Amino acid sequence: ANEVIKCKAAVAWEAGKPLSIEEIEVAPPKAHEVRIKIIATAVCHTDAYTLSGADPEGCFPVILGHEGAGIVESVGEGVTKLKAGDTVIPLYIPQCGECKFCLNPKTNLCQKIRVTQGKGLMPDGTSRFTCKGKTILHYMGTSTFSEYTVVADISVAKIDPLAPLDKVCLLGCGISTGYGAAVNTAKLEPGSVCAVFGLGGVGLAVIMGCKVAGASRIIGVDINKDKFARAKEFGATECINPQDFSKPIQEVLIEMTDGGVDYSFECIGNVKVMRAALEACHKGWGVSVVVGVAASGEEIATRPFQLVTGRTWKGTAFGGWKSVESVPKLVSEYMSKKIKVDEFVTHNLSFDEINKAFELMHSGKSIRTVVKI
């Protein structure tokens, strides 16, 4: 039978402190739950933002991490589509396939377990993690910063058994989000002129998507010129630094493109840049997609004239991919060389030095750091 597992995990006891490598207990999977052995995980801005304690609904203690890949260790009662040994990727955006959202082709925002997940609990209202006599909360329904995690059975994508887990764990968030922003949300046409604000993993993934879509011109924008080289390798036709111009960035872009871009993507989470991205779009048909997540309370603004004269403001979550059915296909596209994943890995670390992954992010010297469990 499925026994409690004693393993290692990176616990965040409180905000503003480095993660603590602890020995924890992981309970067996209950009905419709899946226990996964995490093989590799990466760190994302979102993990750091929750860890900083600036996130309103961020609670502690908690096991963070939402970019991972592993193998099913055991399944709970009623689970038949998955079994021990299956190669998988945990999903923070699930796909029950039955709610009004899953049934609507225009969205991927399954709401089946959103409430419990937001509270760091499994669908039944409890947590499977414990450490030193204390209950530890789940995070984004994945909690990949542990040798073993338990997730709702609708939060699992079964992928190619041959996929390199130390690479595809990145499809758990960043790459998929940016790529999907281009092909699912924007659905840009061949020849499109694009502008991408923010050249981190998300922005690079957007560029990658724009290239797959056949974009003619792809202008990368970042205040950190060190990000330009890789952006060009991904397909950016040119890059510009807002700091190099006295005029607002939207004015610069409008001048460069004789009117503005056909599509702009904000991959930073800065409301001021979001406005610039919208205003940088061409009159009549320009479309701007918000991909970055802004701090709570902050709002975007512009003059309605911008919309009346043809521009559209959109946003995306996990690139609009219906998770369970898309992630496996994304893995296959990587396996077949249609999209890149390896090029996103700039650093590799062992589980014990996971905190170094956070240092690297604050330093601005990394795209994605893969942590080997």
Q: Is 370 near Zn ion (CB under 5 A)?
A: no
User: Euclidean distance between the first and final Cα of the chain, in Å?
Assistant: 25
217 is catalytic: no
Residue nearest to ligand APR (CB): 200
Q: Is 44 annotated as a binding residue?
A: yes
By a kind-dependent CB cut-off of 5 to 8 A, residue 187 interacts, out of its own copies, K ion, Zn ion, none, with K ion
Q: Is 7 annotated as a binding residue?
A: no
Q: Is 323 near ligand APR (CB under 6 A)?
A: no
Q: Is 316 near its own copies (CB under 8 A)?
A: yes
Interface region with its own copies, contact rule CB under 8 A, candidates 52-60, 78-86, 240-248, 281-289: 281-289
149 is catalytic: no
Burial 207-220 (b: 16+ CB within 10 A, else e): bbbbbbbebebbbb
Residue 240 sits at the vertex; the CA angle it makes with 231 and 229, to the nearest 5 degrees, is 30
Q: Is 305 near its own copies (CB under 8 A)?
A: yes
Element of type H or E holding 181: none
Q: Is 345 near ligand APR (CB under 6 A)?
A: no
Cβ within 8 Å of residue 114, ≥6 positions away: none
Q: Is 110 annotated as a binding residue?
A: yes
Between 153 and 192, how does the x/- string for binding to K ion read (CB under 5 A)? Answer: ----------------------------------x-----
- Contacts of 46-49 with C-beta under 8 Å, sequence gap 24+, read 46/140, 46/173, 46/293, 47/139, 47/145, 47/358, 48/358, 48/361, 48/362, 49/293
Query: DSSP for 96-144?
Result: -S-STTTT-TT-----TTHHHHHTT--TTS--SEEETTEEEB--TTT--
Q: Is 297 near its own copies (CB under 8 A)?
A: yes
Cα gap 223→272, rounded to integer Å: 14
The residues that touch its own copies, with contacts defined as CB under 8 A, are 100-101, 104, 106-107, 109, 259, 271, 274, 283-285, 290-291, 293-294, 297-317
The residues that touch Zn ion, with contacts defined as CB under 5 A, are 44, 46, 96, 99, 102, 110, 112, 173
The residues that touch ligand APR, with contacts defined as CB under 6 A, are 44-46, 174, 177, 197-203, 221-224, 227, 242, 267-270, 273, 291-293, 364
